[PDB]
Design a protein around this nucleic acid. Structure first.
Length: 74
DNA sequence: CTGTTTTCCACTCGTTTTT
DNA sequence: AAAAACGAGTGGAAAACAG
């Protein structure tokens, strides 16, 4: 039922991630995490060329997976 | 320290895209 | 037709927390 992330969208999320590295990545933390994530989700869902609206869980899952499957460029 | 709660990540499943 | 990629669920490791 739910679509997939477009290329452009992936670039957007990657950009946001690279920006807020120091807050969401354990490897940089060593403030509100939830609010930072919410900020990212908001910025994404507000982005014009967005396919579908996502919740915080989906975004986080994309973060986790893109790291797992080693495609996170930053 | 011990014991509880929260957050992160490897493994995997069912489907969909790509070779 | 086979392999790779993708979204998603989960258990338990790792970490953060309370006493």
């Amino acid at each position: 039922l739910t679509p997939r992330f477009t290329a452009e969208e992936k670039e957007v999320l990657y950009t946001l991630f690279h920006l807020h590295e120091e807050v969401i990545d354990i490897k940089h933390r060593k403030y509100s995490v939830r609010e930072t994530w919410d900020k990212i989700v908001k910025d994404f869902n507000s982005h014009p060329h967005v396919s579908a609206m996502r919740n915080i869980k989906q975004i986080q899952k994309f973060w986790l997976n893109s790291r797992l499957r080693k495609q996170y460029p930053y």
